[PDB]
């Protein structure tokens, strides 16, 4: 039976309207150990010049790919958001700078014909620090405005390298997204709305405590206690840890659900631009108070609404 996210997002209902067939999704992550249920294809390794993206030594990319496009099975209730997509694996990050490799891999995924690009990477900077990523900005522009790729990126997780942003100050009408309060810049997160940046929520529909907040958060999706597929294409729900099993949590998995939705929206409305797919996803999200905020952006995605609601098309750009 179903992973809580599958039920929460009404994935089976959504898949009555599209499955992602004809769409290619690139997974810019730690690589993928492929399998019949996670049939990723080599999209390049940008960490090690040898290797091709089809090796996951971090128990991560494999699960990201499965959330987006893991095929169903008659013997368990797991299926990805869009089980009919082509999956390309670009290994761009690995624990077992990277902003330079990110620009390259974004261009490369676009050049491979990816129409949806999922980026797990979330680099954090002090707000005071001088940030130079002209070529990343150029890469994203190319991929989106020239190649017509929808790009979905992780909000980022709080941690050692990455401190939480305070909420906007309600007493400054002209800073509704709290730019003046930002302490940590997340990238490529801060490219939203050009890309779509995705925060994490728990089973209670509330923002995950580890989810990075900011003026750039565009949407949200399940990112806690998740189920996905492992190195064999079989259900997995934890990684082994020092004091026990660690559940599958991360804004990159949240991003992965949204990339999946984007591929569904793409199959169903093949003439929408990236900006229009993005708009369709955010316009049909369950909005927070105020309609937008720093934690969930436009709110938690709603795949069925995204696929079936009639909404004015936004600008094409």
């Amino acid at each position: 039976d179903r992973p809580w996210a599958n039920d929460y997002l009404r994935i089976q209902e959504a898949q009555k309207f599209a499955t992602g067939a004809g769409v290619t999704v690139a997974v810019i992550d730690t690589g993928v150990n492929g399998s019949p249920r996670v049939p990723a294809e080599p999209g390049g390794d940008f960490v090690d010049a040898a290797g091709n993206g089809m090796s996951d030594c971090d128990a991560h990319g494999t699960m990201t790919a499965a959330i987006i496009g893991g095929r169903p099975s008659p013997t368990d209730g797991f299926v990805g958001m869009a089980p009919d997509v082509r999956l390309l694996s670009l290994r761009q990050t690995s624990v077992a700078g990277s902003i330079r490799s990110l620009a390259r891999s974004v261009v490369h995924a676009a050049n491979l014909g990816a129409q949806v690009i999922n980026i797990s990477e979330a680099a954090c900077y002090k707000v005071t620090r001088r940030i130079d990523e002209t070529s990343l900005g150029a890469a994203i522009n190319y991929a989106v405005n020239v190649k017509g790729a929808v790009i979905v990126v992780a909000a980022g997780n709080t941690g050692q390298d990455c401190s939480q942003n305070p909420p906007p100050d309600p007493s400054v009408p002209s800073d509704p997204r709290g730019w003046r309060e930002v302490q940590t810049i997340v990238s490529p997160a801060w490219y939203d709305p050009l890309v779509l940046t995705v925060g994490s929520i728990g089973q209670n529909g509330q923002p995950s405590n580890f989810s990075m907040s900011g003026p750039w958060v565009g949407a949200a999706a399940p990112g806690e206690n998740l189920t996905s597929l492992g190195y064999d294409g079989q259900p997995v729900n934890a990684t082994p840890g020092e004091d026990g099993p660690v559940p599958l949590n991360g804004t990159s998995f949240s991003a992965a659900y949204v990339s999946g939705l984007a591929a569904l929206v793409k199959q169903r409305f093949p003439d929408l631009t990236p900006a229009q797919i993005i708009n369709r996803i955010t316009a049909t999200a369950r909005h927070p108070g105020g309609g937008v905020d720093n934690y969930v952006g436009a709110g938690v995605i709603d795949p069925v609404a995204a696929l079936t609601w009639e909404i004015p098309d936004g600008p094409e750009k």
Binding site: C57, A59, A96, S228, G230, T239, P245
Partner: peptide, 10 residues
């Protein structure tokens, strides 16, 4: 390389 992900039965 980290150990593979696993499945914990409910």
């Amino acid at each position: 390389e980290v150990p593979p992900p696993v499945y914990i039965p409910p």
